[PDB]
Amino acid sequence: KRRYRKDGFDLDLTYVTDHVIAMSFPSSGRQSLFRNPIGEVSRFFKTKHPDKFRIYNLCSERGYDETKFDNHVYRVMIDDHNVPTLVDLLKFIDDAKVWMTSDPDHVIAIHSKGGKGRTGTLVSSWLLEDGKFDTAKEALEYFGSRRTDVFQGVETASQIRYVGYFEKIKKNYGGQLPPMKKLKVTGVTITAIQGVGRGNGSDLSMQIVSERQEVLLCKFAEGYNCALQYDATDDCVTCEVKNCPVLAGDIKVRFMSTSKSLPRGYDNCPFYFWFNTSLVEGDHVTLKREEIDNPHKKKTWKIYRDNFTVKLTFSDAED
């Protein structure tokens, strides 16, 4: 188990490396799910790494008394089962890099609620930055082998994607954001639709979210900002998307259903994903089952079949 039971401490805490710690939330309130008493976590860092630690809180949902950590806490606002913006991810990387380069004995402790999904995203990103790994896949697998025992380390497909994005940023874009590409979504295509909701796209709606605001809503059956086509022969739906505003940066696409058959997973919906417009190649992005948030869980694999995919078609909106 990922339980630290050494030197008179008992904490949900992992040394991923000698200087990089992953842990769950340092709690003080009512006993709920995850349970690291903040007094003990603070005692740990003050005893084991005096004046040489920095704590990263990745929860958008909850802060705490940071003076328990002598005010050495940096917050990254990420929603549970979601991803940081690439802007925020790079910000974090730079902060950690400055901190770590200043003293070889400096440590960083990254936490979220469980110290799983969000924590794994930034831990694996840091490990790429520090050069321990050269691919996202290996960094993620390492986090999994050290902490979560999940094969790919993190909780969602978008989390996997975003560590991949960081790898691309380091390798192809000199550690900085790629040149911005502005896009409009003009279509969405979903394959292997039978058995998903009403099996014909009629139950489905799609919400596009940018900077924590809804920027487009499409309701398929109704033709609300769209025009649905169902082809039974190809077991797919094709939906023309109308009136999409110019999209830039990190975009969250959520699919909702009026269907009672289709279960909700993370993010209070059947399936969703994040992508970044600047890392889109060509005029589409296509995601397989394992690349979509919620269908990526094997528990859903008799609903989302092996050929379940979602494709967004884009137009260039640079002008």
From TrEMBL:
The UniProt record lists the keyword Ion transport: no
Domain Phosphatase tensin-type: 2-173
Broad class of the protein's primary localization: membrane
Domain Tyrosine specific protein phosphatases: residue ranges: 84-147
UniProt domain C2 tensin-type: residue ranges: 175-317
Alphabetized GO MF terms: monoatomic ion channel activity; phosphatase activity
GO cellular component assignments: membrane
Protein location: Membrane
Keyword vocabulary terms for this entry: Hydrolase, Membrane, Transmembrane, Transmembrane helix
Membrane topology: Multi-pass membrane protein
Disulfide bridges in this chain: 59-112
The name this protein goes by in its record: Voltage-sensor containing phosphatase
Species assigned in the record: Ciona intestinalis
Gene field: Ci-VSP
Whole-protein coverage range: 252 to 575 of 576
